[PDB]
């Protein structure tokens with residue numbers, strides 16, 4: 269079974285649209301989104317489709333770029349650090365569940381290097 273996806277809307281939450289959060293959506297996420305290796309990370313891991321019933325027994329804080337994109341489009345975050353933390357959870361989950369040298373890890377490593385290049389300087 270797949271768990272419910274992470275929440276992307278929360279009215280009880282203080283929201284903000286800072287210059288950096290706009291940049292994280294308009295330039296950072298949407299550059300990463302078009303990368304040739306982005307597709308595994310554009311939605312939650314479908315453990316049912318992959319027949320990996322073990323994935324959510326190991327990864328207890330799932331995150332993906334589809335969730336992040338929705339959060340940004342809902343002004344879910346208070347600051348850019350919260351959004352950057354979600355990206356880093358996504359990469360770290362991949363490094364936890366898989367092993368160095370695995371194909372999915374090469375993909376995440378390529379995406380993470382681009383991510384770090386783009387957030388090195390924020391508005």
Ligand SMILES: Cc1ccc(N(C)C(=O)c2ccc3c(c2)N(C2CC2)[C@H](C)C(=O)N3C)cc1
Pocket residue numbers: 308309313314318320323361362365366371372
């Ligand atoms: C090289 C590769 C890439 C994509 C897939 N396909 C079809 C996925 O749907 C998929 C999406 C996301 C992940 C994964 C598969 N893998 C599994 C491959 C170990 C683990 C759970 C993971 O960490 N992520 C992020 C299969 C192989």
